[PDB]
Amino acid sequence: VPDPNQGLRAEWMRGALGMLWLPERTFNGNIEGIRIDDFLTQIKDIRTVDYVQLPLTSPNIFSPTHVAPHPIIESLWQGDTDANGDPINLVAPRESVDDPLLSWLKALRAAGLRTEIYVNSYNLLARIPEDTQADYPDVSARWMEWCDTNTEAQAFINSQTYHEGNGRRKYMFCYAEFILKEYAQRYGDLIDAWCFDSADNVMEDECGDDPASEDVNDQRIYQAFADACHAGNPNAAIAFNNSVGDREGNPFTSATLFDDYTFGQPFGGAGNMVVPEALYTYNHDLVVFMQTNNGYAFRDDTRTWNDNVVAHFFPKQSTTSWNAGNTPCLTDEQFVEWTSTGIVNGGGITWGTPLVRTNLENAPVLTLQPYALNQFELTDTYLKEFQSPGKPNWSRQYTILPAIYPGQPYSHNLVEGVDFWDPEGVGITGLTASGTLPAWLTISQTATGTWTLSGTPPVSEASNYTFELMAQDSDGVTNREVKLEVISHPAGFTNPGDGTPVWFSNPMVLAKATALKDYGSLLKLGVDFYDFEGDVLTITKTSGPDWLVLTQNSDDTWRLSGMPTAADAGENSFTFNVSDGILSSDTEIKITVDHVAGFTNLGNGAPVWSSPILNLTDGKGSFAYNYTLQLGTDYYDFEGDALTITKTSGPDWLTIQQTDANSWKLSGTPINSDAGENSFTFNLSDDTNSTTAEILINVIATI
Ligand SMILES: [Ca+2]
Ligand SMILES: [Ca+2]
Numbered sequence: 001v002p003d004p005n006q007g008l009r010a011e012w013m014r015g016a017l018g019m020l021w022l023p024e025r026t027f028n029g030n031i032e033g034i035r036i037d038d039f040l041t042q043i044k045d046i047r048t049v050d051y052v053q054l055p056l057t058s059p060n061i062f063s064p065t066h067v068a069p070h071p072i073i074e075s076l077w078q079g080d081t082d083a084n085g086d087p088i089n090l091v092a093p094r095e096s097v098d099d100p101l102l103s104w105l106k107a108l109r110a111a112g113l114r115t116e117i118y119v120n121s122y123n124l125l126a127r128i129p130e131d132t133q134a135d136y137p138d139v140s141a142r143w144m145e146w147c148d149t150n151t152e153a154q155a156f157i158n159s160q161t162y163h164e165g166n167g168r169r170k171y172m173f174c175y176a177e178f179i180l181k182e183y184a185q186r187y188g189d190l191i192d193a194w195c196f197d198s199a200d201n202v203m204e205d206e207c208g209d210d211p212a213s214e215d216v217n218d219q220r221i222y223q224a225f226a227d228a229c230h231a232g233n234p235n236a237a238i239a240f241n242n243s244v245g246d247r248e249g250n251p252f253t254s255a256t257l258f259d260d261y262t263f264g265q266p267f268g269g270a271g272n273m274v275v276p277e278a279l280y281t282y283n284h285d286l287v288v289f290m291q292t293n294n295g296y297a298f299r300d301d302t303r304t305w306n307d308n309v310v311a312h313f314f315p316k317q318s319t320t321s322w323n324a325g326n327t328p329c330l331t332d333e334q335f336v337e338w339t340s341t342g343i344v345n346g347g348g349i350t351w352g353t354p355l356v357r358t359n360l361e362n363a364p365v366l367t368l369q370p371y372a373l374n375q376f377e378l379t380d381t382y383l384k385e386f387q388s389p390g391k392p393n394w395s396r397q398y399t400i401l402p403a404i405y406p407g408q409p410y411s412h413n414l415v416e417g418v419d420f421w422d423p424e425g426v427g428i429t430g431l432t433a434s435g436t437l438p439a440w441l442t443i444s445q446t447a448t449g450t451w452t453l454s455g456t457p458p459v460s461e462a463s464n465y466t467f468e469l470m471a472q473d474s475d476g477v478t479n480r481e482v483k484l485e486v487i488s489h490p491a492g493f494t495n496p497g498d499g500t501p502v503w504f505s506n507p508m509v510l511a512k513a514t515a516l517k518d519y520g521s522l523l524k525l526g527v528d529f530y531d532f533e534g535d536v537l538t539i540t541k542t543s544g545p546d547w548l549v550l551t552q553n554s555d556d557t558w559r560l561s562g563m564p565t566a567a568d569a570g571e572n573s574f575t576f577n578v579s580d581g582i583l584s585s586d587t588e589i590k591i592t593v594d595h596v597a598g599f600t601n602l603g604n605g606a607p608v609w610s611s612p613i614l615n616l617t618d619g620k621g622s623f624a625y626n627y628t629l630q631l632g633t634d635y636y637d638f639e640g641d642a643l644t645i646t647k648t649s650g651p652d653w654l655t656i657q658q659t660d661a662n663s664w665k666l667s668g669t670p671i672n673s674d675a676g677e678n679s680f681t682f683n684l685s686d687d688t689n690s691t692t693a694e695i696l697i698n699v700i701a702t703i
Helices: 008-013 037-042 071-075 100-110 139-147 151-157 169-190 199-204 220-230 278-292 332-343 370-386
Strands: 017-020 051-055 114-120 193-197 237-240 348-350 355-357 365-368 410-415 430-435 442-447 450-455 465-472 477-484 521-524 538-543 549-552 557-561 570-579 584-594 613-615 625-630 644-649 655-658 663-668 676-685 690-700
Touching: 008 237, 017 370, 037 100, 037 365, 051 100, 071 169, 100 114, 100 169, 139 151, 139 169, 151 169, 169 220, 199 220, 199 237, 220 237, 278 332, 332 348, 332 370, 365 370, 430 442, 538 549, 644 655
Parallel strands: 017 051, 017 348, 051 114, 114 193, 193 237, 613 690
Antiparallel strands: 355 365, 410 450, 430 465, 442 450, 465 477, 521 557, 538 570, 549 557, 570 584, 625 663, 644 676, 655 663, 676 690
């Protein structure tokens, strides 16, 4: 401090277009199996987009919830469960199950895109200590309890004098060293940028740091957070949200000693960033500021060290939120205008791009709103023609080639209009390479506009290649660095020789299913199934009980779901085929189905109720009463036989009727004359046996 590489490592952000892909409610294994591949297929034709912002933590009160596995965060869970059997206090994916973030990071890299990572600065600490979160009530307390009762933690806290101070300062340093650093070191250079929201809210307003100060001692939490990220990738760009700047001056609040780029929160609070009307002026002037200052935020002030800090904006495309929204806030013409003013010879914009449905608990559709794609494709057309005129433009940030498979036929296409284009529309007149190339590699035009890198490497090939790839139009040549890497096979698989796609083991024992509960198990490439030649693979269910449903999530991830009934109890056997189109191999899949807990098995083969007396919710005088009895909560059969509930005794007002296969509805209006405890008996009978239970409703008289 001060860093000579401050802002210079964010040099790529000048002229960069960004997007936001953010799912909501990521707690308790909801994020396990979630993939970005659907989004990337939808944005295929967008060729001028440079990066995508991903979460590590969620915003606001959802800051403890993580989308990446960590042993310290996983130990905070302690195996807590609810009434249904689902996890509680699990604010991360389980390390044994899935790393969803790594999947997205690799998929974005394969798409030729850089990454920005969202982390809310409040993190595992609770934003509102007075509030308790229904899905994770104890996590924040348990994180605090871990920090002042661990040998490795206390040795770090005591290691420096500045670590303790006002508020929850000691826990903030703990997150940077043990959680944030361990994450950054794992993913390496797959993360290009970090943005830290609510930075001033917790680091300044609670923990007593000064973001305005030039002194290193005043920005120690800022140091701890930045150095943690630089431990994994030293070239990672860092931003802190120290709120919006001044409308009557610099629209970005002045940089800390650890800001590579400006977080760039728009003017106005929640909701529309252009309505009311004055906010349009403020936020567009911010965009114009980026243009006037060539994408450098702080070349106006009297400070020398912040001269390379990149001007960057984080707006909302919609009228409501950053990650979702039904309505655009700007018109098609305005959206293109705002972006081009902001980035073309300016700075960078990460557009808060709305998805259809972000709630993972409510059938998530994690692809763009049709308008968001519409506005982005129109912007894409403009930037293709006008951002870098003359010489050819290479798409996005990287051009990624397939891995070298020794002895195997290599072939990859690079398409005009896709990987590269002449901005003026005459056309690409040729593509050649320069540098240390493979001897087997051939570059030729197979069709009009499509160039092919083909050939067959020898079995002895075990060296990586790095060379420039030159694309030509009538104006000149643009270079793009392309890499070739030899494939590294995962351990635990035996190469069959002939190139048959192989399963890990026969048979395969997966996690235990439970009756009347939605099952969740993943099948991942390089873990459960593998192809030694890297062909695109298909999994098929061939035999077994009907309940198990197979769905594809991505090229490397498949999901097993479905609800087993009471009839499916015991060991279940399945056959699953992995194929490449030529060759295939089968395996046996073994999933044990347990009965619903709480219900007592009599042995007579008879149905059973949850209790001898079912004490229902209170009723009200002259008000309509509703209660639904569900299978596996109130009543259960151990064989899975069709069940019928009939009334046998009790007051006239309450009657029963079947809603569906699982549920039976109790309805009727009680009056003030029916006040007090109301006794009922109901009979549950299948094809043979029968059983009775008492139902108790306390009718309250309205006075
Ligand atoms: Ca300056
Ligand atoms: Ca094969």
